[PDB]
Ligand binder design. Structure first.
Ligand SMILES: CCCCCCCCCCCCCC(=O)SCCNC(=O)CCNC(=O)[C@@H](O)C(C)(C)COP(=O)(O)OP(=O)(O)OC[C@H]1O[C@@H](n2cnc3c(N)ncnc32)[C@H](O)[C@@H]1OP(=O)(O)O
Length: 435
């Protein structure tokens, strides 16, 4: 009743170009957090069933092996054909097998949790729902959990109220393994964001981006002025910048730990799931390479800085010139630039971190460009708000809502000022980066 009013103002907020959750362990819109913790009363793996939920006649569940060749393919057919909301938008997600070999083969992954739904006779995958187990860090407290991603239902049967059962099953499949919480992120407004960030875009090939109608021409600007505006150099600028390597880890894992700890919602990385996350499947041609990791090694051997980014390209339709779009997304980064200071928000410690973040992420743009990326993405999350405006990361209209399943939390800052502008003042406290 009051929660509906708040939902509207929040939806009104994000506006641009509940029979299920009404019975789920989530924060409601009105609810002011008294104490951070579990919603649902403490349950046990035996209090939770072992029956995969029955679904409408003609369907069945299916576990999907990422090691299996044709199983993985089914997914990145259905996702590619259906993930794009509009069928006429003239672009599609192109999830490649190399991509899911990274994102679905998580250390601690179990093919049982890469749930799917098939049609009985035809063996046609019509829905997929993934979950990969991680340990979170909600304001100082260590919450062992799981990340739910890649929810998707076949165009031809939406409004079929199947997503509930898809969430309800993964709920059960996780629940029986001694895990009862989750991080999950959506673009649409659901009952109880802990935070919201905003998508932003950095041209790398503006000439192209225009010719595909992903960016336009502002009032009183030549097609030329814009080319000259976003133009980048060929070589990365900052001293001793190198690709991440097996040996770097223990120095980087410390650097990333010390840095990441400032945020209120981080993933606790175990040195092994960190290594799986930042070193990609070895030997892959430049157009297949999923993850891109980089690190600064001082002359002595000290690793000062670290950044990484992942490629998820679109396929482009109805365009003679171009067949697809190279899309890099900024990921997890680190730097010691503000370590000597006591306070993160000390104006001198902020200017010290900033001018570093400008350099490192400027060099990221060069590198992404060099890997044949057209547009480099980054949210208003983390300390990102420091460089975005300076590095021509013009605003995008996308809003990412971060939600926690079965855990109360007071609003974590997202890097947005109430008027949707970038919050240069307080930055952001969101530490995790979802896909
Ligand atoms: C402890 C661990 C337990 C694990 C559980 C973790 C819980 C977290 C799980 C959350 C998943 C993480 C999300 C990601 O991974 S994000 C992935 C979202 N993906 C996309 O938007 C692109 C592809 N989209 C599709 O295929 C669409 O058809 C979707 C699937 C989005 C809607 O499909 P459809 O149009 O056919 O809907 P329905 O009739 O079957 O079902 C209607 C109900 O579903 C609610 N709905 C609609 N969209 C979403 C959405 N994106 N998240 C959560 N809920 C959503 C909706 O409010 C309604 O419920 P209620 O509002 O009436 O109650």
């Amino acid at each position: 009743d009051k929660a509906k009013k708040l939902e509207n103002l929040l939806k009104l907020l994000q506006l641009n170009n509940h029979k299920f959750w009404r019975t789920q362990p989530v924060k409601d819109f009105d609810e002011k957090v008294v104490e951070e913790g579990p919603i649902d009363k403490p349950k046990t793996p035996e209090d939770i069933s072992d029956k995969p939920l029955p679904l409408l006649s003609s369907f069945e569940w299916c576990s999907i092996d990422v090691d299996n060749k044709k199983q993985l393919e089914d997914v990145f057919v259905l996702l590619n054909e259906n993930y794009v909301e509009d069928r006429d938008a003239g672009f599609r997600f192109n999830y490649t097998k190399e991509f899911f070999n990274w994102a679905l083969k998580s250390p601690g992954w179990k093919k049982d949790w890469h749930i799917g739904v098939r049609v009985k006779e035809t063996q046609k995958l019509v829905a997929f729902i993934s979950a990969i187990p991680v340990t979170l860090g909600v304001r100082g407290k260590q919450v062992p959990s799981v990340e739910i991603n890649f929810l998707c239902v076949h165009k031809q049967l939406r409004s079929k109220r199947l997503t509930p059962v898809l969430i309800k099953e993964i709920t059960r499949r996780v629940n029986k393994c001694d895990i009862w919480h989750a991080l999950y992120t959506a673009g649409i407004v659901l009952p109880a964001p802990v935070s919201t960030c905003r998508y932003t875009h950095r041209p790398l090939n503006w000439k192209k981006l225009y010719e595909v109608d992903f960016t336009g021409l502002p009032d009183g600007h030549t097609e030329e002025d814009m080319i000259a505006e976003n133009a980048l150099p060929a070589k990365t600028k900052t001293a001793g910048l190198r690709k991440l390597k097996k040996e770097d880890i223990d120095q980087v894992f410390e650097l990333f730990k010390r840095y990441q700890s400032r945020f209120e919602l981080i993933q606790i990385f175990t040195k092994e799931e960190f290594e799986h996350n930042f070193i990609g499947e070895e030997s892959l041609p430049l157009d297949k390479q999923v993850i891109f990791s980089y690190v600064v090694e001082q002359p002595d051997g000290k690793i000062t800085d670290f950044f990484s980014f992942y490629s998820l390209p679109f396929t482009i339709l109805n365009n003679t010139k171009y067949k697809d779009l190279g899309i890099g997304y900024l990921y997890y980064y680190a730097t010691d630039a503000d370590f000597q200071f006591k306070d993160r928000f000390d104006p001198k410690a902020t200017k010290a971190l900033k001018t570093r973040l400008c350099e490192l992420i400027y060099d990221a743009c060069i590198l992404a460009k060099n890997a044949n990326m057209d547009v480099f993405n980054a949210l208003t999350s983390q300390d990102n708000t420091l460089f975005l405006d300076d590095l021509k990361f013009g605003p995008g209209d996308g809003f990412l809502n971060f939600y926690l399943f079965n855990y109360r939390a007071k609003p974590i800052t997202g890097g947005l000022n109430p008027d949707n502008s970038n919050d240069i003042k307080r930055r952001s406290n969101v530490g995790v980066v979802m896909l």
